[PDB]
């Protein structure tokens, strides 16, 4: 694994010597399976906007 | 002493007022034709690959 850039909010490692199935598994995990926190419910007391 | 029919007229004149034609110049349009859409100069790529 070689790491070309790593600003904050960016990474560009290489990952030399792995198949397309494992690379695709890693890509699909980041997009759809790594957990995050986000607003689910909203209680609106007044809203004259 | 009355009015009597006189000799028949020998001719008729019909008058009308008419102006004339100018030269044919045929100036079709201020900015004429359909001017073509075209390239902005230089432009430059606005995108790069990663790595």
Curated annotation (Swiss-Prot), chain A:
Lineage: Eukaryota, Metazoa, Chordata, Craniata, Vertebrata
Function: DNA-dependent RNA polymerase catalyzes the transcription of DNA into RNA using the four ribonucleoside triphosphates as substrates. Common component of RNA polymerases I and III which synthesize ribosomal RNA precursors and short non-coding RNAs including 5S rRNA, snRNAs, tRNAs and miRNAs, respectively. POLR1C/RPAC1 is part of the polymerase core and may function as a clamp element that moves to open and close the cleft.
Name the record gives this protein: DNA-directed RNA polymerases I and III subunit RPAC1
Subunit structure: Component of the RNA polymerase I and RNA polymerase III complexes consisting of at least 13 and 17 subunits, respectively. Pol I complex consists of a ten-subunit catalytic core composed of POLR1A/RPA1, POLR1B/RPA2, POLR1C/RPAC1, POLR1D/RPAC2, POLR1H/RPA12, POLR2E/RPABC1, POLR2F/RPABC2, POLR2H/RPABC3, POLR2K/RPABC4 and POLR2L/RPABC5; a mobile stalk subunit POLR1F/RPA43 protruding from the core and additional subunits homologous to general transcription factors POLR1E/RPA49 and POLR1G/RPA34.
Outcome of substituting residue 24 to S: In HLD11; decreased localization to the nucleus and retained in the cytoplasm; loss of association with RNA polymerase III-transcribed genes; decreased association with RNA polymerase III complex; probably prevents RNA polymerase III complex assembly and activity
Protein family (similarity comment): Belongs to the archaeal Rpo3/eukaryotic RPB3 RNA polymerase subunit family.
Disease with which this protein is associated in UniProt: Treacher Collins syndrome 3: A form of Treacher Collins syndrome, a disorder of craniofacial development. Treacher Collins syndrome is characterized by a combination of bilateral downward slanting of the palpebral fissures, colobomas of the lower eyelids with a paucity of eyelashes medial to the defect, hypoplasia of the facial bones, cleft palate, malformation of the external ears, atresia of the external auditory canals, and bilateral conductive hearing loss.
Compartments it resides in: Nucleus; Nucleus, Nucleolus; Cytoplasm, Cytosol
Swiss-Prot record, chain B:
Region (Disordered): 18-41
Subcellular location: Nucleus, Nucleolus; Chromosome
Compositionally biased intervals (Pro residues): 29-41
Residues bearing the modification Phosphoserine: 26, 34
Function: Component of RNA polymerase I (Pol I), a DNA-dependent RNA polymerase which synthesizes ribosomal RNA precursors using the four ribonucleoside triphosphates as substrates. Involved in UBTF-activated transcription, presumably at a step following PIC formation.
Remaining remarks: It is in an antisense orientation to and overlaps the gene of the DNA repair enzyme ERCC1. This gene overlap is conserved in mouse, suggesting an important biological function.
Complex formation: Component of the RNA polymerase I (Pol I) complex consisting of 13 subunits: a ten-subunit catalytic core composed of POLR1A/RPA1, POLR1B/RPA2, POLR1C/RPAC1, POLR1D/RPAC2, POLR1H/RPA12, POLR2E/RPABC1, POLR2F/RPABC2, POLR2H/RPABC3, POLR2K/RPABC4 and POLR2L/RPABC5; a mobile stalk subunit POLR1F/RPA43 protruding from the core and additional subunits homologous to general transcription factors POLR1E/RPA49 and POLR1G/RPA34. Forms a heterodimer with POLR1E/RPA49. Part of Pol I pre-initiation complex (PIC), in which Pol I core assembles with RRN3 and promoter-bound UTBF and SL1/TIF-IB complex.
Protein family: Belongs to the eukaryotic RPA34 RNA polymerase subunit family.
Protein's UniProt name: DNA-directed RNA polymerase I subunit RPA34
Organism for this UniProt entry: Homo sapiens (Human)
């Amino acid at each position: 694994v070689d790491v070309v850039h790593m600003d904050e909010n960016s990474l560009e490692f290489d990952m030399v010597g792995i198949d397309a199935a494992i690379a695709n598994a890693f890509r699909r995990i980041l997009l759809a399976e790594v957990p995050t926190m986000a607003v689910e419910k909203v209680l609106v007391y007044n809203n004259t906007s | 002493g009355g009015l009597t029919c006189a000799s028949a007229p020998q001719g008729t004149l019909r008058i009308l007022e008419g102006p004339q034609q100018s030269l044919s110049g045929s100036p079709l349009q201020p900015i004429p034709a359909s001017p073509p859409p075209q390239i902005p100069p230089g432009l430059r790529p606005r995108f790069c690959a990663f790595g």
